[PDB]
DNA sequence: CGGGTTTTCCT
């Protein structure tokens, strides 16, 4: 598997809006409790949801996949990720619905072969015989680091006007600037593998042949997220991102690193990686770290400089 | 009767929506904890033939006792109910006898999320041991069933409805069981409550009450 | 694509304004999160919005399009970019509203053959069958460089009077001086290309004929932004501008150069460009640099002298 | 050593 914790710095930003009130567009915020000597304070802090990141990742994967000739669904060629959910979706693509429970695996293989996104992204089909497939990529909310006794995040309202020669023209937009952190998980070992018990159905050999290419494409799609091509309102409110700290761990067993909420979260995850490998009888365990804010690292870790090096090293192994 | 303790560090919080407007729960139900435990062995499969119907790859761990409690402060917010408690700590206690200590420890080191995909949770430390059964008056922090009597002052008790393992099969609703939570509604925290009970396991001083 | 990062130095400036209090006219300000040796801090700093830059760019595009014989819409001929949002604009221009979803492509092509501004800068129509077209040029707020521990910017208020022979006449104006930075993105591979999915509609041949001229005009329109013809209050508060550093990159794949916040942001973006071309299986990657402050550049980089040479080189390729 | 800024406007 691949696990990662990443720390970002963003300025003059509005990527995730919410329900509009009057003539105002509001940012997405969540409540947090901060501890003080006097007591506790409740503060509202901007956040970015976990769905925009998934949409950006899926779009990048579609763009990369169509270049290498891998199959892509008809409705997913257009950036409309409904997937093969209801009968109307199946009608356009041209797949017969599953007959019964015993035939579910065949339907899963057919869907998996007719669309890469339905494989990596996962799908759910509602009906008499539902079929399930959990996503291979796990992403969490982007929340600024609650480090120390101060929250480094702000949120202001800006006033904008449209000019006209015959007045008879005003709107407001919320802008922010925070220090974001998020973590993610990916399991390249389960790519191109069906997820239902039964007997092998004709057509799995094509999946075995396409496994390597699908894994390579899925790994390549992480470059977009780690480079900052997510969110909205980029036409006039293009943000200004920057990378500060990054820890990525590759293993052969379940594991995740510490959240990037403390100033020292690499030493802890290295020690816990050592202990987990010791206890779970693992064989492979590698850690790559990119450091730009000068925090303590530890020993026994390869130090990179950019994200392209990280992607190359991830693909090689 | 063996027991194990696990310490989890949460990333942003957990979210489980009530069955049947989408309000959420305050603390994860035992079904979620049992599923998180079972993930360590059944990783990669989403449908197993139970014998009559495909319901879940978790209908086999249904006889493992589990409880959990908070150790920090958080807020419940609807904006799809969520419980924000970033960088918090969750302490989970597993009591069972089906498998030996080695298997339970191996499965305990293999927990990745609680609830939905976004609710990732790291693991910091585990403990394994043998528990003892008592029936005297004890003080506890973990939530228990409705039928358990109470001796202290009713000031920090809430009522929730959970489901049994019967709900593990799709297209079917689990039985409703009442539960009592010793939690302060705002801000979220845990408080100690003294109970008499009949069965309580000592897992290191923090007695766990089951009935 | 064409992606750029630009650094400007402005003195005694008042280009973007906000609501007034009393006899005082205020300058737009925003909060920024900055990293110092002592941690992370929050500051309030003057900024210039991105919609002013978009307005200047579109006005220059209107001028060039009228000069070169390309069609320009009736309302947009006067510098009023309501485009085709409301029904009054449609009635004035004389275009029928779409009937159903299948008619959306016809409406988009019809609007797109009358105004180059709608084609390049996108538009939106809300109704029974909404029609969207994302802008093909992306801008952001103009922020001063967040370098070191001290922000190089200052803001103050100034006193002014109006003379009269019969007293019965005093105002204040905020004036700023700073080192601004901003970045931009322009994808010319989608200009003069319909975006709504559907069948072929008569009139696309004319678009194919005019594509080359539209691309040429769109590239030429960047001279205004790269020169400094933007902002208001230029009649009495004409600013003193001077370019300091510029990096422009031409690629065949998505890419974003580093923000102009650190003194070393030209070497880093060139190294990243090389590695990204290596990893994404690209086929074209060129970089152009304008340097006037003697900072590190690198090796094997084309070095220009002015902005006109850059515009000519962009046009020729 | 005496002397230490006077008005008329403040959108």
Swiss-Prot record, chains A, C:
Q: Which family does it belong to?
A: Belongs to the CRISPR-associated protein Cas7/Cst2/DevR family. Subtype I-a/Apern subfamily.
One GO BP: defense response to virus
Signal sequence coordinates: none
Q: What else is on record for this protein?
A: Crystallography and cloning were done with strain P2, while interaction experiments were done with genes cloned from strain P2 but over-expressed in P1. The aCascade complex was purified from strain P1.
Keywords (alphabetical) are: Antiviral defense, RNA-binding
**What is the name of the protein in this document?**
CRISPR-associated aCascade subunit Cas7/Csa2 2
Against InterPro entries, the record matches this protein to: Cas7/Cst2/DevR_sub_I-a/Apern, CRISPR-assoc_Cas7/Cst2/DevR, CRISPR-Cas7/Cst2/DevR
**Could you tell me what this protein does?**
CRISPR (clustered regularly interspaced short palindromic repeat) is an adaptive immune system that provides protection against mobile genetic elements (viruses, transposable elements and conjugative plasmids). CRISPR clusters contain spacers, sequences complementary to antecedent mobile elements, and target invading nucleic acids. CRISPR clusters are transcribed and processed into CRISPR RNA (crRNA).
Q: How does it assemble?
A: Part of the aCascade ribonucleoprotein complex, minimally composed of Csa2 and Cas5a, which binds crRNA. Other possible components of aCascade in strain P1 are Cas6b (SSO1437) and Csa5 (SSO1443), while SSO1399, Cas5b (SSO1400) and SSO1401 have sometimes been seen weakly associated. Csa2 is probably the major RNA-binding subunit. The Csa2-Cas5a-crRNA complex also binds target DNA homologous to crRNA, probably forming an R-loop. Purified aCascade forms a filament about 6 nm in width.
Q: Name one GO molecular function term.
A: RNA binding
From Swiss-Prot, chain B:
**What's a single GO BP term from this record?**
defense response to virus
Q: Which GO terms describe its molecular function?
A: RNA binding
- Cite the CDD domains for this sequence: Cas5_I-A
The UniProt keywords, alphabetically, are:
Antiviral defense, RNA-binding
UniProt key word RNA-binding: yes
What protein family does this chain belong to?
A: Belongs to the CRISPR-associated protein Cas5 family. Subtype I-A/Apern subfamily.
Q: What other note does the entry give for this protein?
A: Cloning was done with strain P2, while interaction experiments were done with genes cloned from strain P2 but over-expressed in P1. The aCascade complex was purified from strain P1.
Its assembly, as annotated, is: Part of the aCascade ribonucleoprotein complex, minimally composed of Csa2 and Cas5a, which binds crRNA. Other possible components of aCascade in strain P1 are Cas6b (SSO1437) and Csa5 (SSO1443), while SSO1399, Cas5b (SSO1400) and SSO1401 have sometimes been seen weakly associated. Csa2 is probably the major RNA-binding subunit. The Csa2-Cas5a-crRNA complex also binds target DNA homologous to crRNA, probably forming an R-loop. Purified aCascade forms a filament about 6 nm in width.
Task of the protein: CRISPR (clustered regularly interspaced short palindromic repeat) is an adaptive immune system that provides protection against mobile genetic elements (viruses, transposable elements and conjugative plasmids). CRISPR clusters contain spacers, sequences complementary to antecedent mobile elements, and target invading nucleic acids. CRISPR clusters are transcribed and processed into CRISPR RNA (crRNA).
Q: What is this protein called?
A: CRISPR system aCascade subunit Cas5 1
| Organism expressing this protein natively | Saccharolobus solfataricus (strain ATCC 35092 / DSM 1617 / JCM 11322 / P2)
Q: What is the lineage of its organism?
A: Archaea, Thermoproteota, Thermoprotei, Sulfolobales, Sulfolobaceae
């Amino acid at each position: 598997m691949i696990s990662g914790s990443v720390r970002f710095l963003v300025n003059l930003e509005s990527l995730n809006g919410v329900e509009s009130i009057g003539n105002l567009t509001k940012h997405r915020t969540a409540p947090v409790v901060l501890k003080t000597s006097t007591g506790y304070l409740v503060r509202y802090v901007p956040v970015i949801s976990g769905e925009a990141l998934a949409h950006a990742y899926q779009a990048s994967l579609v763009d990369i996949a169509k270049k290498e000739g891998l199959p892509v669904g008809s409705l997913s060629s257009q950036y409309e990720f409904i997937k093969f959910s209801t009968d109307e979706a199946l009608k356009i693509e041209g797949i017969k619905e599953p007959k019964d429970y015993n035939d579910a695996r065949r339907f899963e293989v057919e869907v998996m072969l007719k669309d890469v996104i339905a494989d990596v992204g996962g799908f759910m089909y509602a009906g008499g015989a539902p079929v399930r497939r959990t996503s291979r990529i796990k992403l969490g909310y982007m929340i600024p680091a609650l480090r120390g006794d101060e929250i480094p995040a702000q949120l202001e309202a800006q006033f904008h006007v449209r000019f006209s020669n015959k007045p008879v023209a005003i709107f407001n937009v919320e802008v922010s600037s925070a220090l974001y952190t998020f973590s993610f998980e990916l399991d390249e070992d389960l790519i191109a593998v069906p997820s239902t018990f039964g007997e092998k159905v004709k057509g799995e050999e094509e999946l075995e042949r396409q496994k390597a290419k699908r894994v390579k494409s899925a790994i390549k799609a992480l470059y977009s997220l780690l480079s900052g091509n997510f969110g909205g309102k980029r036409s006039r409110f293009l943000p200004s991102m920057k990378l500060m700290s990054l820890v990525v761990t590759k293993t052969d067993f379940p594991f995740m690193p510490e959240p990037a909420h403390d100033d020292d979260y690499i030493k802890t995850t290295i020690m816990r990686l050592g202990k987990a490998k010791g206890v779970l009888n693992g064989n492979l365990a590698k850690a790559y770290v990119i450091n730009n804010e000068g925090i303590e690292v530890g020993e026994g870790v390869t130090v990179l400089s950019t994200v392209e090096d990280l992607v190359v090293k991830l693909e090689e192994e | 009767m063996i027991y194990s303790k696990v310490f989890l560090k949460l990333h942003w919080g957990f979210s489980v929506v009530k069955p049947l407007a989408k309000p959420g729960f305050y603390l994860p139900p035992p079904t979620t904890l049992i599923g998180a435990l079972s993930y360590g062995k059944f990783r990669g499969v989403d449908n197993i033939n139970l014998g009559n119907v495909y319901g879940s790859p978790a209908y086999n761990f249904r006889n493992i006792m589990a409880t959990a409690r908070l150790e920090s402060e958080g807020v419940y917010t609807e904006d799809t109910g969520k419980v924000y408690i970033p960088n918090g700590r969750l302490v989970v206690v597993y009591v069972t006898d089906s498998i030996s200590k080695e298997e339970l420890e191996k499965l305990c080191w293999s927990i990745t999320r609680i609830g939905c995909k976004e609710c990732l949770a790291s693991v910091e430390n585990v403990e394994v041991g043998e528990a003892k059964k008592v029936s005297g008056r004890v003080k506890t922090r973990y939530y228990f069933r409705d039928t358990v009597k109470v001796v202290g002052r009713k000031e920090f008790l809430e009522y929730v409805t959970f489901w049994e393992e019967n709900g593990y099969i799709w297209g079917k609703e689990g039985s409703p069981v009442r539960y009592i939570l010793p939690i302060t509604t705002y801000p979220l925290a845990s408080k100690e409550v003294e109970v008499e009970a009949k069965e309580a396991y000592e897992v290191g001083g923090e007695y766990v009450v089951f009935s």
